[PDB]
Amino acid sequence: SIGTGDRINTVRGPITISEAGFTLTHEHICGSSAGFLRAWPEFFGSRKALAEKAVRGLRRARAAGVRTIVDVSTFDIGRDVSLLAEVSRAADVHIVAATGLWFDPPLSMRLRSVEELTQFFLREIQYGIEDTGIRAGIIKVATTGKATPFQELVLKAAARASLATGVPVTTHTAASQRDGEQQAAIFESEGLSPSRVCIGHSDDTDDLSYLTALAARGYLIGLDRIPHSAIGLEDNASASALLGIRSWQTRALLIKALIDQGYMKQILVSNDWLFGFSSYVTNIMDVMDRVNPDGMAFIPLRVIPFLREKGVPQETLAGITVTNPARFLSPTLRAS
């Protein structure tokens, strides 16, 4: 395989692979909908309040050593690259933007062909997002159980954009339903290397069979929702449905399990946090903030030490939080 220039696109421009440092690979500054943050900022108090909250959070995460986060917010998660650039500069944390489509594509996207979609993903990666010149450094896709016809098109366009640019693909999955397998099937049918793909939300399930089967094939396993837990909130139906009833320690243990299985090179870890969240019930943000006051700092502050205690070597945790993300994000073309 070959590289395209050894640089990773961030919202402040290209950085070298070494500059990425400690990287959280699945995060969000704001989980919203296309055009929403700009049409109704007051839903988050104000765009300023949101920016200010995000800067505090990024600064707290940075104090714990996070130097880079991958904001996997696609067009339909309401990604506002201008907001990302502003908070990245104010907090001095590298932010890698995404292209791709999540599970709320509007009609103008749902009626598109795979060829059309491939050109939109390529546009965001090569030309840049909107008119900002900010190029996407990752392609985000998703399935909530068996892929629907439109989602298959998205996965295929994702694989094509990745094969042409070298930018990796990262996925949302209904991990319990083993979505990662079908996703991998499609990706491979397009000729994409598994090393270019992270099967996300993999800690949303406890089947090590599933996870180790994927890692053996060469995929990156995204254990990205470690702090998500509604334990103690059984009285809240909406928060329970979203966060699940498994402990953060249960999720964290899958990281050690994969390490013991021998797949430390294939693990990517994250919080899947955000500072604003309009695509769910009102006030979900407050509920989650009570659940995990540490926000994106959760991984370094709670998870890394938990694993070290459970016996995982510090050398290994560095490999996971620094080396793996560096290899994943470096634009890499398949050998011609």
Added chain:
Amino acid sequence: SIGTGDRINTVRGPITISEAGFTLTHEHICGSSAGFLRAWPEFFGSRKALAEKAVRGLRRARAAGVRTIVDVSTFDIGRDVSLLAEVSRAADVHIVAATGLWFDPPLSMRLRSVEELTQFFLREIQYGIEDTGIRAGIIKVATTGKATPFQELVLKAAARASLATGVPVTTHTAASQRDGEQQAAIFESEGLSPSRVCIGHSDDTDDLSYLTALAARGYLIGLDRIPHSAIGLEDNASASALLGIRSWQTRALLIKALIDQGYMKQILVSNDWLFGFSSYVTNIMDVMDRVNPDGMAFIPLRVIPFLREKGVPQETLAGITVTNPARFLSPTLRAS
């Protein structure tokens, strides 16, 4: 009833009622999706190409006497008020912007309560769209058959915003399924006066009984799709499903029919045209432009003269295209 200032909000600011003049009440500069025009302008060639096309089309309609158009593009139809302002100034045609929600609300909108929706509509009307200070002069809603639970919330929020601001409500209906009746019932249950409402796409039906009974209750009847016809495109399934097989003459005669039943004051006429269209199959804009090369000028150039030869008095046509839209758009509050 009461006025709130006797001025109509346009994208270039307020205009007196007599400045509105000849007004097309249901049109679009671009029928898209939230954030789409800004994220993928190349889908329309370029933002600049799209804008030049709209200016040309607006100038042609202006040449025929059109002084104002109501762009009923909602947040989810991808309304880009900056684009409206730019072409309004360049073509020197007043454009009234809309708030409300059509049938592609994203998750951040679909999960909102009637109270929350009401605040968003009031925001766009009072404070302005996004951060532009451009205030909505009309509220757009829609159903396509029986109202879904979300759509009932949208209708009620629209009635509450209209009651508070005086701005009228205009609707998209599956006219042949008589949606007008359920919309009316919901609007009247909120205390909205029928005179603040236009039941749109009414010319999509041939059921004069249904139309007259609504007119009788004081509703305005939008015969806004006059040039929509796929006659001669019987081999084009997508175009046929969108435009129908009824001729423009058949649609237009509904204007005469309503006049004959004695409801000239209740009629509003339009083309429901656009210059960019991404929320449907690719290249649909090209098929429509071939169908109706006159575009928005179709009403003044073909329809007004046709009615004239069918015996409708010139003065009655002036009342419909000038007086009725003026009365409709004047923000009007219910009596204290």
